[PDB]
Amino acid sequence: LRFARNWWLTGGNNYELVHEVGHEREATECFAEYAQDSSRDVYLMSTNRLSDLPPGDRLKAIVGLMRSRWEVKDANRGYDKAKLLLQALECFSEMKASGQIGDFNSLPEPDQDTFLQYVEGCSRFAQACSHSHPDAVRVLLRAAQICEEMRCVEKRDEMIQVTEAAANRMDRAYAFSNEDCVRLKNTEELRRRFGNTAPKRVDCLRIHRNRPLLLHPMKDNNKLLELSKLPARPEFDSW
Amino acid sequence: LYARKPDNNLVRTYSTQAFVLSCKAATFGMLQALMKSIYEIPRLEGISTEIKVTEVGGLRDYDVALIGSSGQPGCILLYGGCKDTNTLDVPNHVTVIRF
Amino acid sequence: QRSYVERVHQAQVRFKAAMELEGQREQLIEAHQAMKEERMRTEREKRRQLL
Amino acid sequence: QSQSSRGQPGLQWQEGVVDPRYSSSGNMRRFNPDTVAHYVKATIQNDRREMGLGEVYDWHEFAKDAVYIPTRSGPLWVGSDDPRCAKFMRRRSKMQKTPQQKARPKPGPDPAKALEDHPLREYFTTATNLRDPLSTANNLHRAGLIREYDIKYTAAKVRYVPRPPVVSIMGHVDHGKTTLLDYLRKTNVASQEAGGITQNVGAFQVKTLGDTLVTFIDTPGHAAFTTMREVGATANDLIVLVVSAVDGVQPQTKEVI
Amino acid sequence: NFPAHFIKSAFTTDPLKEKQKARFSSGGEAMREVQDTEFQALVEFIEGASYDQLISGRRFKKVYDVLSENDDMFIWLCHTAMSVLNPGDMRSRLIYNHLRILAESVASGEMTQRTAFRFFESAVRSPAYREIAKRQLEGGAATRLAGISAAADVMRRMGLTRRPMSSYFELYQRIVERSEAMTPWGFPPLFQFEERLSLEPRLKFRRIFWIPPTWNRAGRFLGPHVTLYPGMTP
Amino acid sequence: ADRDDGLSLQRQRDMKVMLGYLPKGNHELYAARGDVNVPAPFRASHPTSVDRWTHPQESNLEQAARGSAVLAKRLSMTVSEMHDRQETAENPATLDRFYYRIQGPALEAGELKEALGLKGNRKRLPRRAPG
RNA sequence: UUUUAUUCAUAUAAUUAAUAGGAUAAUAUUUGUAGUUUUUGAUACCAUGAUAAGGAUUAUAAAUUGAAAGUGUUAAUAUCAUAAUCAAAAUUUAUUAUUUAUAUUAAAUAUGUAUGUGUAGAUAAAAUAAGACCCACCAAUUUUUAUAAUAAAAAUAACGUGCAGUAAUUAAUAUAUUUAUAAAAAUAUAUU
Ligand SMILES: Nc1nc2c(ncn2[C@@H]2O[C@H](COP(=O)(O)OP(=O)(O)O)[C@@H](O)[C@H]2O)c(=O)[nH]1
Ligand SMILES: [Mg+2]
Questions:
Q1: Cβ(D176) – ligand 1 distance below 6 Å
Q2: Measured from the CB, is F18 under 7 Å from any atom of strand G?
Q3: What is the dihedral of CA F29, F33, F35, F40, to 10 degrees?
Q4: Which residues pair with F101 in a beta bridge?
Q5: A228 CA to G35 C1' distance (Å)
Q6: Can you tell me which family this protein belongs to (chain B) (predicted)?
Q7: Which residues in chain F have Cβ-Cβ distances shorter than 8 Å to E15?
Q8: Which of B97, D69, E96, E215 has the lowest tally of Cβ within 10 angstroms?
Q9: Could F67 and A23 be called an inter-chain contact, meaning their C-beta atoms sit closer than 8 Å?
Q10: Which residues contact F98 (CB under 8 A, 6 or more apart)?
Q11: Residues C7, D107: C-beta atoms closer than 8 Å
């Protein structure tokens, strides 16, 4: 019906047809078949320490670390966040120091605002954690040095003022260094009742549709309780 | 980058008496002491004890199910006077040691 | 080849990081134990003197 | 090619004894030259002669390489050089040469670092440091008796009060720890104890000396209860080691010391 | 195993080779370097009798198809069925006009011969036609000859023939076949015509080899021209 | 065991069947048979499968050759021939049209058709991404 | 109650890698050109091609001396493109179509044993320049109903027995009866 048991092709008839056509548009367009090419396929190596990566890749890893910290969402003490932000700023600082074209004056608006928000977040975290960690002002000073390296006087002066004020604040701080009532009333009433004087749970079984069934104790008058109390084998067991 | 591939053609063939053992103590310290003593007990030549369930409660239904269902000889140890709540009946081939 | 070398190098780096973390934990444990021993020695000599 | 009975088998252990077919002495999948009948050997040799194969010389040594094949007829014993088990023998040899031939998933990020980055890390609680008011205030906040802004303020507010002492009675077996506690409490427990042996830790508060509360923990002296001894050692602040006068220092006393 | 021959002409040409091929060979260079169907089939067939050609069965089959491709068989069937009718009866006039329309449609090709034969068999198996034909046969003097002669003449006039005067030779053949008394006049074999038309959509009424044997294929063989026992030609 | 009658025909055939000389499924065998150029499933009843059958996939390096073949044919053709035959840049032009008759074993005939390019089945095609 | 014939004879032994010109030519001692040593399928295996056997049918009548042999497959075999341990010189080793009664060994060593009235069975040859898929038990696990000392069904790739449909080896089927370690049939009707 569908498959042939005979596996030999006989001679005669069996004139198959071959038809070939071609369009110039196919040859001109050539469509596209670039799935994976040598240009887009490259080796990949991994380094544990973040100083091995170049400053750009160091920042590309620092942003992921910041995302992980945000996923943690603990907030509260932010010394680790301050260190991450300081490393992020050090990426720009070493970019400028090494000799890259990146200079704060030459930076475009997006990169300028990114630098500003990074240094602002670092300074905010350092100011928050200055009292908890005595060395947070060190990261504040390092951020101010990074701003000076980038040659941004506007943020540099603010960083210097905030770090001086943080040092002063740290120095000064270190130099300084119904339900219950209802339950109580009920307990008192119960204790008074007990002093003056000087119910039982019933097992429940969820049978069907999670409907409870209560097995209440059998009435004391029926014969079944005495039937259970009587010995099983009179000849063998003691009476 | 490859792990060992199991082969199901090999099967276990019993050479010794396989004693399936369940242990249940009255208290957690009793359970720890019983486990330590059991593991300090050396293995005999023709005896192999397999410890399935160790607990702090009394005899349950799942204990009887684990020990008596398989034809292998079974021992259930009850350290202390823990109250039992098993509704089934323990098979005769299974030794219950209440101590 | 690229996939094999990537996987192997990542595994090596991760194993090194884990071993370094365990070494740091062991050093922390040893320092805490040393502090405990120092405190215990002071307490023992104080106990003898007070007795 | 596969050594497994086609019909679905049941329990291989009878209620009291092991099934002979599944025992080592009567393994159904092992060719036993000491118990096989004449017709089995006749069939094996007939196959080895009908198809080009070596002559069967020693049944005891041939049983080593005898390959078992399940059939509706029963066990089929096929020589290691017989073509029927060629794929099975090839796979077995490849397994013997190199068994680890199945790929496994790449391990992910280290769970230890994942714990550092866990979203619920701040909910972890720790035993209060008995000498740290900051730790006491932090535990108070974590229990929800003070707000998070009251940590440093309540740290100074924390004060220390003398608590009743806890003393653990330890020693060797039959050295009189139970009898000493029994005399102290006037309860007669050493006689009503089952077997005359202590196997459960008991904490009892007594009003002795200057009408002060002292909590005694009766640690058993049997060698097995090392965990109970450790629990008593951790809980108690003072330990009383009772040694018999007639019976000298024992290994249990040595380990307690 | 089997080397790739790539007999396709589109799998053996590439733009790199075509770029150099086009310069040497193109339309301009090629131009610079180079310098009644029945009758045509008949002359093609008979030109094989030249001194440099042979009579081939392909050409004879071609000319036979060209000669027999018409539907004059069906047209003559319809008009022979019409001949027996009575030019005075109104039912006979209706049947005559229906069959004339059928024949005209067949000649024009507007209706396929299969459905035309369905119409024809349904028309000729009707009781009215059978009764009319029975009266025609019973009459001592009948109009069958005049009817069939007029049928040939109208087949010529209306252009229902491959050639203008073929209808008269077909009429002569019809009369000489009527001399054989194969079937009563006006009662064609419908089962026979149905069997014909089920298979054929159109109703109709020293060896030479294209592949010579090779030495590997044939062990001891010389050829179709060699004579092992020749004679002496004067 | 030299001068032995040997295994019976039925026993030998059953042994070969057990060993697996008979394929478990017919899909691979009828795909390589070469009588038809259809893909492995041998049955297309979905619109995408039908489109796959109607428009066989071809690599760009060979589509360029196919278009160059018609470019060369039109270049060889004269202006008047092209205009009369309606062979223009937009109208498609046929390249090859022939009939062949093949006789012999199915598997070997299929392999021969693969070698000659008559059987486009069982062809590996590199993957493509997006457009 | 159509013709013809048939006794047929050698058969194992051992070692296999490179180019280099001359008389009558305006000159080359290059007359006489000097760098050991890291690889391995057939002294015995290549499975694939040919061959054997071997068939087809239109030519009316007149003229003309004319206008007239063609192969699949099944088979066996083998020296070829494909899978390492061994045949070609020292030949006994038995391998189809032969000279029968007048004269019988001179140039490479060239046949001493079968006369028996030409008396079997088998075998070969030709009309040609001649003149005719698949059943039951057994084995093997096991599963359900049942716990009665039950009993029964069913799932199952390699066993051992008997032979069971597919126009199929036998008119078919059904009912009833009978035998054999319990397969297969037999017997007797009814139906088609
Ligand atoms: N004479 C005497 N007997 C003692 C003393 N302490 C314990 N015993 C004996 O030890 C027995 C109880 O042992 P127990 O205290 O329970 O052993 P332990 O729990 O291991 O210390 C009693 O029968 C006493 O007779 C003691 O101080 N004097
Ligand atoms: Mg005690």
A1: yes
A2: yes
A3: 40
A4: A15
A5: 116
A6: Belongs to the TRAFAC class translation factor GTPase superfamily. Classic translation factor GTPase family. IF-2 subfamily.
A7: 64-65, 68
A8: E215
A9: yes
A10: A17, A18
A11: no
List of chain C residues whose C-beta atoms are within 8 Å of the C-beta of residue D110: 14, 17-18, 21
Q: If residue D218 lies in a helix (H) or strand (E), which one and from where to where? A: strand D212-218
Nucleic strand G contacts from chain D, 13-32, CB < 7 Å = 21, 28
B74 near B19, Cβ under 8 Å? yes
Residue B44, strand partner residues: none
CB-contacted nucleotides of strand G (7 Å): 49-52, 56, 64-72, 129, 134, 138-143, 155-160
| D183 alpha carbon, closest ligand | 1
Place of tokens 């932090």: D138
CB contact under 8 A, F95 and A26: no
Whole-number Å distance between alpha carbons of A153 and A155: 6
Of B52, B63, B56, B54, nearest to B80 (Cα)? B56
User: Could you tell me which residues come within 8 angstroms of residue A71 by beta carbon, excluding any fewer than 6 positions away?
Assistant: D117, D119
How are beta strands D202-208 and D166-171 bridged, if at all?
A: unpaired
- Count, residues in chain A: 239
Residue D171 φ/ψ region, left for φ over 0, alpha for ψ in the -120 to 50 degree band, beta for the rest: left
Residue D195's SS3 state is helix
Out of F65, F116, F118, closest to residue E14 by CB: F65
- D65 close to D77: Cβ distance less than 8 angstroms: no
Are residues F105 and A7 in contact, defined by beta-carbon separation less than 8 angstroms? Answer: yes
Q: Is D214 within 8 Å of D164 (Cβ atoms)?
A: yes
Distance, in Å, from the CA atom of E155 to the CA atom of E67, rounded to the nearest integer, reads 18
D26 CB-contact burial (10 Å; exposed 0-12 / middle 13-18 / buried 19+): middle
C-alpha dihedral (F8, F12, F14, F20), degrees to nearest 10: 180
Q: Are strands F93-101 and A15-22 parallel, antiparallel or unpaired?
A: antiparallel
The one-letter amino acid at F126: P
Paired tokens of D76: 């089929």
* Min Cα separation A48/chain C (Å): 6
By DSSP bridging, strand D212-218 and strand D166-171 are parallel
Resolution in Å equals 3.6
Cβ–Cβ < 8 Å for E185, E137:
yes
End-to-end CA distance of chain A: 86
Q: What are phi and psi of E151, to 5 degrees?
A: -65, -45
- The sign of the dihedral angle between the CA atoms of D177, D183, D187, D188 is positive
Q: Residue E176: which residues within 8 A CB-CB, separation 6 or more?
A: none
Identify the experimental approach: cryo-EM
Distance F126 CA to G116 C1' (A): 94
- Sign (positive or negative) of CA dihedral D228, D234, D240, D246: positive
> Could you give the CA distance from residue C50 to residue D1 in angstroms, rounded to a whole number?
83
Identity of the residue in D106, D110, D113 whose CB atom sits nearest the CB atom of C7: D106
What is d(CA A103, CA A152) in angstroms, rounded to the nearest whole number? 9
Quickly count: other Cβ atoms within 10 Å of residue D171's Cβ.
23
Contacts of D139 (CB under 8 A, 6+ apart): D125, D126, D128
Which nucleotide across the nucleic acid strands is nearest to D40, CA versus C1'? Answer: G159
Is E72 exposed, middle or buried, given 0-12, 13-18 or 19+ CB atoms closer than 10 A? buried
Rounded (5°) CA angle B3-B5-B7? 160
* DSSP one-letter code for B14: B
State how far the Cα of A169 lies from the Cα of A161, in Å rounded to an integer. 12
Q: Which residue type, as a one-letter code, is found at position B55? A: E
